[PDB]
C-alpha cells in the first residue's frame, strides 16, 4: 500500500525532497539516482544512491529534481520504464508543449506524469484558477519575493568583471519587480562598466535594477521567498470582489513538498500528463477521503 | 454546446445566481422554478418562471437556491429527472452524509451532483486542502467576517421581547468570533431580560456576545462578508511555513458565482456526487484548456 | 415634504443614481431625461423617460449625470427653469470657474447648485479640508486605485494600432501613480510602435507606464476603485500628527450616492453655487437633526 | 481683521491652546483667564493673565479650556458679555441639551457658540457624518487608543487602597475596549481586594479590565492617543462599501488645534449654538476661499 | 584564534546549537556532552559525544542546552573547570539570583558566564532596553506567538484524561494572550471534565483558554514562533513616540544562534556573570571591529 | 551623584536636548554654550548661557549640538578640558576616522567620547547589530521617512531660481528612496530649468525625484520622521528568519534623548571613544542595575 518513490537528481530541491519523502508515512524512499554517486553528503550516508533507477527495484513514482533543460528527456525515459514522474518544470511558456510530449509517452506505458508542480508554477497556479472560478472577470497579479532568482544570479555572474553575483527579486505590486544585484568583482574590473552592463543585459533591462559591490555574496544568500497574489473582479455582475493570497516560505522546502503531494496524486489519475490545475486537490493528501472531507470542506 | 441551467428556489442567492448565469456566455438560462410564481420582482419580468422544472424542456443542470433543509429531497428529485444539481449546502458536519445519499441517485440516473459549492463550504474548502498539500503538518484557522450571520439573526429574533434582530460575526483570530447583536424590542419588553437570554441561548453562549437596542435593524444590513485563513506548518521537515488567504466580498454574489462555476464543472465529471475538493480546479472555468493552462499555470 | 428629483443623462453613474434615489425614502423619482428615449434598459421599463425636463412637472432638484463638457450649459439651463442642480464635475483646475458661472444664475432664479459632488472631487475634498482643520501645517497626499481611469483608457484607445484599451491607476504613495495599460491591437498593427506611442503620449509621459497586449479588454474591467489619503503635520506647535483615510468602493455607486446626499443638502442652502466643503456635513443626511446629533457627534 | 481670542481655564489643553493660537497668523491672543493668577508656568511669563475676561478689552471669541461640569455656566456668562465661545464638551449624551441651552443665550446676545469641538466629539463626528453621506445604510464603529482615559484613571484612584492610578484604553475592534489599569497601592493595602474592586466598579465592569501594581504611575503617562473608525455599508443599492479613518496623534495638541479652527469658523456663522457637523468645513480654515477651493476640492 | 565550544545537553536547542556552531567559521566544535551517549541521531555520527567535558581537551566555552532546573548546578561545575558558560535560562523572576550565584564562581575561576541569552529572555531584552534609552517614559508590551508553549503543553498533559496535549500562545495585544489547547484523550475519559480542569488549572485560569479534542497532537506541532513589541512614550518632553519590533522565526534556531553569538561575546568580557543587556552588542559579532563599524553604525 | 551636563551649540536638537536634560532626574543642567549669547529664546530666559564652557564650573559631560563640520575640533577641545563628549555626528563613512581621532585625546585626558549617538547613526545601529547577532547571514535594509532631509533641502536651495526648498525622503523598500522636492521660485525664474537642474544635481540624480512649485515651503515642514528596518536571513543553518523594526517619531526629540542616554552611559566606560554598538545597552538607563534587570531581561 506504500507509495515507492525514487529521487532523480539531487540539486537544492533534492535534499528537501528527501526530507519530504521521509516525513510522509505513506511514502517509502526506494533510493536516489544521480550522475556522481561518490559525492555523498551526510544525509545520504544510509541512503541507496545509484546512477541507474532499475537497480532500485519496484518504483511507483520518480521525483525529477534535475535541471530544467534535462526534465523532458528524463521524464520520457522514466515513463518508458513504467514509472510515474513529477517535476517542477518552471518555464511557463513551454508547459503546454511539455504536457503534450509527456501525454503521448505516459499513455503508451499506462503511467501518469504530473508536470510543473512547484509553487509557481504549481500551488500558485491552483490559487489563480480558483480566483477565476470565484470572479471570472477582472485582473490577477502575482508578486514574487523578496527572494533569490537563480536565473538572474546566473545572468549577472556570466558578465565580464563579475566573479560571483546574487540577484534579489523585490515585489513593487501589479507584477512589477525591482532587482537588487550584489556582485563580487574580478581582481582589477571597473565597477561602472559592470553596473551598466548588468542593467543593459536582456534579463534586467525591462526592470528597475540596482547593483552594489560586496566582499562575500554567499553571506547574503537566504532560500526564503514569498508571493502576494491579488484578484479584483466581478462575481456574476457584482464588481469590486477583492481576493488576496500571501506566503512567507522556504523556497526548496515548499517546491519539494508540493512535488511529494503531486506524486501521491499521480497514483490516482488515468494514464496521461497533467498540470496541477487538472488534479482534484484532495488527491494531493494522505488519509481516508471521508475523514479529509469532514476536516476540510 | 451551451450549458442549459434552471434556477430552483429564488432566495437572496437566487437573484445573484440569475446575474451569474446571464453573465456566463457558455450558459443558457432555460428558466426559474419557485413555489410562488406570482411573486415576480423587476428582474424576472422577461424570465420564464414555473413551479415544475419539466416545463423548461432540456435542462443540463439545476442551481438549488433553496433552504438548507430542502436541498437533499430537492436534489434527489432533480437527479431522478436526468438533470445535474449544484447546491451550497452549508452544514459542514452533514456533508459526508449528503454526498453518499446523492452519489447513489446520481449514479442510477447517470448524472452529476456537486454539493456544498459556496465559499464556505466551497472555495475556502479548496484553499484549506491546498494548505495541507503545501504543508501537511501544522494548524489552519478560518476567520469569518465582519459579516451578517443568518443562523444567529434567526436565533436572536426567535427570543421573547425581540421584534427583529441582526447578528454580526467579527473575527478575533484562531477561529474565535465576537457576535454583535442589534435588536428591535417588542413594545413593552425589558432590555436586560432580552440581553441575558440572547447571551445564554445555545447559539451565543460559547462566544463573546454584545447586544445593543436600535430603532431600525434593516438600515444596518450589508451582505458584505470576508474570510482570513492562516496556515502555519511544516513542508517536509522545514517549520514556520506561513500561508494566508483573505477576501472582502459580496456574500450572495460569490456564493452564486461559485455555484455557476461548479455547474460548468459538473458537465465534465463521471456520474456521482462530489465536494469541490474532488473536482479538478480548471473544470470550473470557461475556455480552451490550452489557453487556460498558458494563462494560469 | 418628499424631495422631487430628475436624473439628467444616463451614463454609468445614471443607473447607480436611479438606485440611490429609489433607496432614499425622502426622495421621489419624478423621471429620467436623456437624448435617446428609445434606448430603454431593463431598469427603465416602468420609469418615465423624456427628452424635456418640463414634462416631469414639479422637480426640486436635477442630478446631472452627463459628460464633463456638457455640465456647465446643462446646469445654467436647469437652474433657469427654477430647479436645483447637483453634478460630479471632475476637472479640479476648473471648479472655481464653474462655481462663479453657476452662482450668478442660481442667485437670479433663487435656486442652489452643488458642484463637484462625487468622491474626488467630493467626499475626499471634505476629508482634505478636515485634515487642515486638525493640523494646518504639513503635507497631504491623495493616492488613487487600483481602479480604471476613463480619461487614460480613451487617450490610449485614440492611438494608431489600438482597437480598444483599458488603463488602470495604481497608487505608489505620495501622489505618484503607475499606469497599467491593456490593449487590443487592430489586425496587423506593430506592438512596439503602439507601446512607445502610449508611453510618449502627454497623458502617460509623466508616469511609470506598462503596456500589455490582450485578446478581450472587456473581461478585465471592474468599477471597483479606492483612495488612501495621508496627512503628516502640526497641530498648533506639536509635530508628527499622523492621519489616514482609506476606502475600497464601487466607483459609480459612491459617486451617485454622494450626489443624492448633495441634492438633499441643496434644499437647505441660501440661493447660490457651492462646493461640498461649503455645506454643513449634517445637511447631507436624512432624519431629525437632534436624533442625528445624538447618533453622530 | 485679526480674530481676538481669550483662553478661559488652563488645564492640559490650556497650554496647547496657547500654542495653537500663537501659531495661527490670523489670531491675536488678548490673554488667559484663570482662578489662580499667581500660578504662572514658564510659557505665561510674558502673557496677560487675569481672573476677569473684561480686563482683556475687545475679545471676539473665548476658548473654554475648563472642566466639563463648568462649561455650560461659563459659556452663558461669556456669550452674555457679547463674546463667542468654543468648547470641547465631551459628554456625548448631553450635547443636544448643551446646544439648546447655549442657542437661546447666543441668539439673545447676537453671538456664536461652537460646542463639542475636540476630536471626539469633534473631528471624528464630521468623519462619522461623511460616512452616512457616502453610504447611509450599514454599521460605523469608533475604536479608541491606545491612550490614557482621564475618566477611568480618576474612577480607579477614587477606590480604597489606591494612592494613584493610570487607565489605558485599548481598541479590540467593533467599539469593544480593553482597559489596562496601573496602580500605586497605599502603604499596607491588599492587592487582590483593590484589583476585584476596580474590576467590579461601574466604570470597568462592562469591559475586559487588567490591573498591574507599579512603583511610579507617572513614568507610564503619555498623551499620545488614536482612533480607527470603520464603516461597512450600502451606497444606493450597492453593498460592501468599505471606509476607514485612522490617526496616531497628541491628544491635547489636536483637541486645542480643532478648537482654534472652530473659533475661526465661529466668526462666519449666524447667531446661535452649533455642533461641528453644522459648520461648513472650509469655515475652519485660514486663507482666501478660492485659493482653498483650488487646493482642496 | 578559533573559539573552542562544547555543547552540554542535546534537547531541541541542542541540534540547532550544533548547526549554529558548524556554520560559524570562528568556532571549532570540540564535542557534545550528554548523559546517554548511545542515543546518537544521524547528525552526531561523526561528532565526538562524551558524558564528561574533560575528555574534549581545551574548551573555551560551553553552550548549556539542558533543562531549566539543571542550568545553575551545571554552570557552576563548568565554570569551576575554567570554561565559560552560555545558557538561555528562561525564568525571568530568577535571573538576578542566577547572575549573583554565577558571578561569585566565574570570578573565582577567572571565567565569564552569559545567562538568559535566548530570544526572550535574550534578544528581546536588548530591544526593551533600547526602547527606554530612546523614550524612558511610557509603556512597553511584549506579545508572543503564534507559537507552542512547552510549559503550558506539559501543564495540560499532566491532567487526568489527557494522553497528550499541545498549547498554542496567541497574541491579543498589550501583553494579553489567548491559549489554544489541543488534547488527545485517554481511552474512556470525559471531555467536559478535562476541558473545565485545563481551564481551571493555575497555568491557564488567568487567560482566555480554548480546548479542542484531536486524534494526533504531533501533526499540529510547528517550532515557528514570533514576537511583536510596542513602546509608546516620551523622548525628553515630546510625547507619542511610537516604536515597534516584530519577528516570525524558527524558535530553537534563533535561541541556539543567539547563544553562539553570546559565547563569542563571552571571550571579550572581564571575569563575571552577565545578562545580554550588560554586553556591548558588537561583541556578539565575528569580524574586524572597524569593518563592522563601517557596515553597521 | 547627579550627572552635570553642558549643551554646546543650540540648533534644532539644542532645544530638544534642553528638554531631555530637564526631564532626566539624574542630570543637572549646568548651562548652554553658544557663539551668540544675546539670541535668547523663551526657554533660555532662566538658563545660564555663556560662550565659554569654563564659566559653568564642574561639568561631567557636554552634548555637542553643533554643525557636523564643527564636531571633531569641538570634541577634542572639550575632552582636553577633562569633560566627556556626546555627539550625533551623522556622516556614516567618516565614523571610524572620528572614533580614532577622539580615542587618542579621550585617553590622554582620561575622559570618554560617545560619537554618532542619534537614531541613525545611533539607535538604528544597535538594532542592525542585534539582527546580525540573531541571524549573521542574509540582508538588512534601512528605509527612512517619510521625513525632511536637511542635506537635500540645502542642495536644492543652493540652485539658481530657488528662493527656498524642502526635500522629503520617502521609503520605497530595500533602501531605495523617492525624493519629493517643494520649491519657492525667485521672482522671474523658469520652472522647467529649475526642475531639470534639481533632478540632475549629484544629491538627486541617483534617486526618483519629483519637484512641485509652492507659495510657502515653511507651512509644509514637519520634524516627524521614521524608519522601517528589515532583516531576512539564517540563524545557524535555518533560513527565512524574518525581523522588522519600525518607528514613527519626532526627529530632534529622539536624537537629543538618545544623546542624553549616551551621556549617562559615558560616565561608566573606561577612557576612550565609542560608537553606541560598543556600549552595554543597560548603561544608557537611569536606575538600580538589579531593578532594571528584573524589569527588562
Q: What is each CA distance from D263 to C242, D43, D88, D111, F256, in whole angstroms?
A: 23, 22, 11, 12, 35
Length of chain C: 297
Cβ(D110)–Cβ(D87) under 8 Å?
A: no
Bridge-based pairing state of the strands B61-64 and E147-148 = unpaired
Residues 111-150 of C with CB under 8 A from F: 136-139
Cβ(F172)–Cβ(F187) under 8 Å?
A: no
The residues that bridge with B235 in the sheet, in sequence order, are B238
Q: How far apart are the C-alpha atoms of C240 and A236, rounded to whole Å?
A: 45
Bridge-based pairing state of the strands C238-250 and C224-235 = antiparallel
Tell me the torsion sign for CA atoms F162, F168, F171, F172: negative
Q: How far apart are the C-alpha atoms of C117 and C62, rounded to whole Å?
A: 13
Chain A: partners with 3+ C-beta pairs within 8 Å: B, C, E, F
Q: How far apart are the C-alpha atoms of B227 and B175, rounded to whole Å?
A: 10
Q: How far apart are the C-alpha atoms of B292 and B296, rounded to whole Å?
A: 6
Cβ(C280)–Cβ(D278) under 8 Å?
A: yes
The residues that bridge with B273 in the sheet, in sequence order, are B113
Q: How far apart are the C-alpha atoms of B93 and B103, rounded to whole Å?
A: 17
With the CA atoms of C196, C200, C206 and C211 taken in that order, what torsion angle do they form, in degrees rounded to the nearest 10?
-30
Burial B259-293 (b: 16+ CB within 10 A, else e): bbbbbbbbeebeebbbbbbbbbbbbbbeeeeeebb
Query: CB neighbours (10 Å) of residue F159?
Result: 18
Chain D: partners with 3+ C-beta pairs within 8 Å: B, C, E, F
* Burial degree of E57 (CB within 10 A; 0-12, 13-18, 19+): exposed
Tell me the torsion sign for CA atoms F96, F102, F105, F106: negative
Q: Which residues of A touch E43 (CB under 8 A)?
A: 42
Residues 58-97 of E with CB under 8 A from F: 92-93, 95-96
* Burial degree of D202 (CB within 10 A; 0-12, 13-18, 19+): exposed
B107 CA to centre of own chain:
24
Which residues lie closer than 8 Å to B221 by C-beta, 6 or more apart? B148, B166, D137, D138
Cβ(D286)–Cβ(C282) under 8 Å?
A: no
Q: How far apart are the C-alpha atoms of D154 and A125, rounded to whole Å?
A: 58
Q: What is the DSSP string of E80-97?
A: HTT-EEE-----GGGHHH
Per the entry, the structure determination technique was: X-ray
Q: How far apart are the C-alpha atoms of D201 and D157, rounded to whole Å?
A: 12
Q: How far apart are the C-alpha atoms of F256 and B95, rounded to whole Å?
A: 65
Give the closest-approach CA distance of A109 to chain F in angstroms.
41
Of C170, C219, C249, the CB nearest to A137: C219
Cα angle, residue E27 at apex, residues A166 and E30 outer, rounded to 5°? 135
Q: How far apart are the C-alpha atoms of A114 and C105, rounded to whole Å?
A: 73
Q: How far apart are the C-alpha atoms of F258 and F7, rounded to whole Å?
A: 14
Three-state secondary structure call for residue B186: coil
Structure letter (DSSP) for residue B162: E
Bridge-based pairing state of the strands A224-235 and A238-250 = antiparallel
A123-134 vs B289-296: helix axis angle to the nearest 10?
120
Bridge-based pairing state of the strands A162-171 and A177-185 = antiparallel
With the CA atoms of D58, D63, D68 and D70 taken in that order, what torsion angle do they form, in degrees rounded to the nearest 10?
-10
**CB contacts < 8 Å between D and E, how many?**
45
Q: How far apart are the C-alpha atoms of F157 and F210, rounded to whole Å?
A: 15
Cβ(F205)–Cβ(F199) under 8 Å?
A: yes
For domain B3-121+251-296, give its CATH number from 3.40.50.720, 1.10.274.30, 3.90.1150.10, 3.30.70.20.
3.40.50.720
Q: Which residues of B touch E146 (CB under 8 A)?
A: 139, 174, 232
Furthest C-alpha separation in chain F: 67
Phi, psi of F47, rounded to the nearest 5 degrees: -105, 130
CATH class, range F143-224: alpha beta
Which residues lie closer than 8 Å to F119 by C-beta, 6 or more apart? E134, F227, F247, F249, F251, F254, F255, F258
Helix or strand holding residue F15 (H, E):
helix F12-23
Strands (E), B150-223: 162-171, 177-185, 208-213
Instruction: Choose from F170, F173, F239, F242 for mutation: most chain A CBs within 10 A.
Output: F239
Structure letter (DSSP) for residue B225: E
Phi, psi of A262, rounded to the nearest 5 degrees: -65, -40
Q: How far apart are the C-alpha atoms of E74 and E67, rounded to whole Å?
A: 10
Q: How far apart are the C-alpha atoms of C266 and C243, rounded to whole Å?
A: 30
Residues 198-237 of B with CB under 8 A from D: 210, 218-225
Q: What is the DSSP string of E123-188?
A: HHHHHHHHHHHH-SEEEEEEEE-SEE-HHHHHHHHTSTTEEEEEEEEEE-STT-EEEEEEEEEPTT
Nearest to A234 by CA among A131, A140, A129, A138: A138
D220/E138 CB distance under 8 A:
yes
Nearest to B177 by CA among B219, B226, B215: B226
Tell me the torsion sign for CA atoms A118, A121, A123, A126: negative
Cα angle, residue D151 at apex, residues D145 and D153 outer, rounded to 5°? 80
Phi, psi of A205, rounded to the nearest 5 degrees: -75, -25
Domain boundaries of chain A, sorted by first residue: 3-121+251-296, 143-224
Nearest to B62 by CA among B82, B42, B45, B43: B82
Length of chain B: 297
Q: How far apart are the C-alpha atoms of A114 and B284, rounded to whole Å?
A: 20
Cα Rg, chain A, nearest whole Å:
21
Q: How far apart are the C-alpha atoms of E295 and D246, rounded to whole Å?
A: 37
Which residues lie closer than 8 Å to C213 by C-beta, 6 or more apart? C182, C183, C184, C185, C191
Give the closest-approach CA distance of C47 to chain B in angstroms.
12
**Sheet strand arrangement including B147-148:** B147-148, B162-171, B177-185, B208-213
Structure letter (DSSP) for residue F119: B
Q: Which residues of D touch E242 (CB under 8 A)?
A: 224, 248
Q: Which residues of B touch A119 (CB under 8 A)?
A: 134
Q: How far apart are the C-alpha atoms of A12 and D219, rounded to whole Å?
A: 53
3-class SS letters over chain A: CCEEEEEECCCHHHHHHHHHHHHCCCEEEEEEECCCCCCCCHHHCCCCEECCHHHHCCCCEEEECCCHHHHHHHHHHHHHCCCEEECCCCCHHHHHHHHHHHHHHHHHCCCEEECCCEECCEHHHHHHHHHHHHCCEEEEEEEECCEECHHHHHHHHCCCCEEEEEEEEEECCCCCEEEEEEEEECCCCCHHHHHHHHHHCCCCCCCEEEEEECCCCHHHCCCEEEEEEEEEEEECCEEEEEEEEEEEEEHHHHHHHHHHHHHHHHCCCCCEEECHHHCCHHHHCCCCHHHHHHHHC
* Burial degree of B73 (CB within 10 A; 0-12, 13-18, 19+): exposed
Q: How far apart are the C-alpha atoms of E216 and B31, rounded to whole Å?
A: 49
D71 CA to centre of own chain:
12
Which residues lie closer than 8 Å to F218 by C-beta, 6 or more apart? C137, F164
Cα angle, residue B164 at apex, residues B19 and A238 outer, rounded to 5°? 15
Burial F56-72 (b: 16+ CB within 10 A, else e): beebbbbbbbbeeeebb
Q: How far apart are the C-alpha atoms of A35 and A39, rounded to whole Å?
A: 10
* Burial degree of F218 (CB within 10 A; 0-12, 13-18, 19+): exposed
Q: What is each CA distance from D10 to D16, D24, D91, D239, in whole angstroms?
A: 9, 19, 20, 47
Nearest to C175 by CA among F182, E30, F14: F182
Q: Which residues of F touch E129 (CB under 8 A)?
A: 281-282, 284-285, 292, 296
With the CA atoms of D225, B145, E181 and E185 taken in that order, what torsion angle do they form, in degrees rounded to the nearest 10?
170
Q: How far apart are the C-alpha atoms of A281 and B277, rounded to whole Å?
A: 5
Output D261-264 pairs: Cβ under 8 A, ≥24 positions apart.
D261/C133, D261/C134, D261/C136, D261/D117, D261/D285, D262/D86, D262/D114, D262/D117, D262/D122, D263/D3, D263/D5, D263/D27, D263/D61, D263/D63, D263/D84, D263/D86, D263/D114, D264/D3, D264/D24, D264/D26, D264/D27
F9 CA to centre of own chain:
14
3-class SS letters over chain D: CCEEEEEECCCHHHHHHHHHHHHCCCEEEEEEECCCCCCCCHHHCCCCEECCHHHHCCCCEEEECCCHHHHHHHHHHHHHCCCEEECCCCCHHHHHHHHHHHHHHHHHCCCEEECCCEECCEHHHHHHHHHHHHCCEEEEEEEECCEECHHHHHHHHCCCCEEEEEEEEEECCCCCEEEEEEEEECCCCCHHHHHHHHHHCCCCCCCEEEEEECCCCHHHCCCEEEEEEEEEEEECCEEEEEEEEEEEEEHHHHHHHHHHHHHHHHCCCCCEEECHHHCCHHHHCCCCHHHHHHHHC
Cα angle, residue C270 at apex, residues C269 and C274 outer, rounded to 5°? 65
Q: How far apart are the C-alpha atoms of F41 and F43, rounded to whole Å?
A: 6
Give the closest-approach CA distance of D59 to chain C in angstroms.
20
Nearest to F126 by CA among F294, F289, F284, F296: F284
B140 CA to centre of own chain:
21
Which residues lie closer than 8 Å to A111 by C-beta, 6 or more apart? A79, A82, A83, A84, A85, A271
Peptide bond between residue F249 and the one before it cis (omega within 30 degrees of 0): no
Which residues lie closer than 8 Å to B218 by C-beta, 6 or more apart? B164, D137
Query: CB neighbours (10 Å) of residue B137?
Result: 19
Q: How far apart are the C-alpha atoms of F84 and F61, rounded to whole Å?
A: 4
Of F146, F210, F224, the CB nearest to C239: F224
Query: CB neighbours (10 Å) of residue A82?
Result: 12
E23 CA to centre of own chain:
19
Q: Which residues of C touch B248 (CB under 8 A)?
A: 248
**Which parts of chain C fold into alpha helices (H)?**
12-23, 71-80, 95-108, 123-134, 150-157, 191-200, 251-266, 289-296
Nearest to B27 by CA among B66, B55, B74, B59: B59
Q: Say if A19 is an interface residue toward chain E (CB within 8 Å).
A: no
A220/F139 CB distance under 8 A:
yes
Cβ(F248)–Cβ(C240) under 8 Å?
A: yes
A152 CA to centre of own chain:
16
**CB contacts < 8 Å between B and D, how many?**
45
Structure letter (DSSP) for residue C55: G
Q: Which residues of C touch B43 (CB under 8 A)?
A: 42
Nearest to D21 by CA among F215, F221, C136, F16: C136
CB hemisphere CA count around A178 (13 angstroms): 14
Q: What is each CA distance from A19 to E20, E219, F30, in whole angstroms?
A: 20, 16, 67
Q: What is each CA distance from B250 to A246, B256, C15, D141, E265, in whole angstroms?
A: 21, 10, 19, 20, 57
Burial C4-14 (b: 16+ CB within 10 A, else e): bbbbbbbeebb
Bridge-based pairing state of the strands A3-8 and A27-33 = parallel
Burial C231-260 (b: 16+ CB within 10 A, else e): bbbbbbebbbbbbbbbbbbbbbbbbbbbbb
**Resolution for this PDB entry, in angstroms:** 2.6
Q: How far apart are the C-alpha atoms of E273 and D100, rounded to whole Å?
A: 71
Q: How far apart are the C-alpha atoms of F147 and F153, rounded to whole Å?
A: 11
Residues with their C more than 2.5 Å from the N of the next written residue in chain F, i.e. before a break, are none
Of F96, F280, F297, the CB nearest to E121: F297
Tell me the torsion sign for CA atoms B129, B130, B131, B134: positive
Amino acid at each position: 500500500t506504500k507509495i515507492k518513490v525514487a529521487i532523480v537528481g539531487y540539486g537544492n530541491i533534492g535534499r528537501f525532497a528527501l526530507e519530504a519523502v521521509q516525513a510522509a508515512q505513506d511514502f517509502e524512499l526506494v533510493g536516489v539516482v544521480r550522475r556522481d554517486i561518490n559525492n555523498v553528503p551526510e544525509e545520504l550516508q544510509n541512503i541507496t544512491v545509484t546512477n541507474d533507477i532499475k537497480t532500485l527495484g519496484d518504483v511507483d513514482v520518480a521525483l525529477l529534481c534535475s535541471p530544467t533543460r534535462a526534465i523532458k528527456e528524463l521524464a520520457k525515459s522514466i515513463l518508458s520504464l513504467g514509472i510515474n514522474t513529477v517535476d517542477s518544470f518552471d518555464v511557463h511558456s513551454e508547459i503546454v508543449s511539455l504536457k503534450t510530449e509527456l501525454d503521448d509517452v505516459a499513455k503508451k506505458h499506462d503511467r501518469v506524469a504530473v508536470i510543473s508542480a512547484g509553487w509557481d508554477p504549481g500551488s500558485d497556479s491552483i490559487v489563480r484558477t480558483l480566483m477565476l472560478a470565484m470572479a471570472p472577470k477582472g485582473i490577477t497579479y502575482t508578486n514574487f519575493g523578496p527572494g533569490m532568482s537563480m536565473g538572474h544570479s546566473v545572468a549577472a555572474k556570466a558578465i565580464e568583471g563579475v566573479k560571483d553575483a546574487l540577484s534579489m527579486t523585490i515585489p513593487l505590486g501589479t507584477g512589477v519587480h525591482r532587482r537588487m544585484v550584489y556582485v563580487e568583482l574580478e581582481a582589477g574590473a571597473n565597477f561602472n562598466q559592470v553596473e551598466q552592463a548588468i542593467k543593459a543585459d536582456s534579463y534586467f533591462s525591462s526592470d528597475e535594477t540596482h547593483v552594489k559591490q560586496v566582499d562575500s555574496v554567499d553571506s547574503l544568500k537566504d532560500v526564503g521567498h514569498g508571493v502576494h497574489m491579488t484578484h479584483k473582479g466581478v462575481s456574476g455582475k457584482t464588481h469590486n470582489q477583492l481576493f488576496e493570497y500571501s506566503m512567507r516560505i522556504n523556497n526548496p522546502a515548499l517546491t519539494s513538498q508540493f512535488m511529494v503531494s503531486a506524486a501521491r496524486a499521480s497514483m490516482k489519475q488515468r494514464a496521461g500528463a497533467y498540470t496541477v490545475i487538472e488534479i482534484p486537490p484532495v488527491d494531493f493528501l494522505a488519509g481516508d477521503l471521508n475523514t479529509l472531507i469532514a476536516k476540510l470542506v
